[PDB]
Ligand SMILES: Nc1ncnc2c1ncn2[C@@H]1O[C@H](COP(=O)(O)OP(=O)(O)O)[C@@H](O)[C@H]1O
């Protein structure tokens with residue numbers, strides 16, 4: 107996980123940053139999967155990121 | 156798959172209690188309930204249909 111934050115302006119927590127970490131293996135490897143995270147943990151912030 | 160729960164982000168999340176409140180059925184609801192039970196038995200309850 108080596109994200110370039112620019113235009114991230116909002117702030118994200120550690121486990122959501124790990125959400126982008128595990129999301130980096132999807133598009134880079136051309137793999138598609140289901141992301142199911144506990145409700146209230148901000149999956150939408152991960153998608154926007 | 157990707158799955159995380161609140162246990163990792165826990166200890167900053169407040170408590171969650173599930174209460175059970177019992178409310179006795181009213182008078183006209185007791186009459187109407189038994190009435191629909193008997194009238195349902197006139198239809199054979201339609202349990203196995
Ligand atoms: N970095 C953050 N700081 C504070 N609150 C956040 C952060 N990220 C997400 N949230 C909160 O988490 C909620 C996420 O809701 P949403 O992603 O729409 O549905 P769900 O998280 O249930 O899948 C938002 O209402 C937001 O207020």
Ligand code: BEF
Pocket residue numbers: 143144145146147149
């Ligand atoms: F999972 Be959250 F409630 F959109």
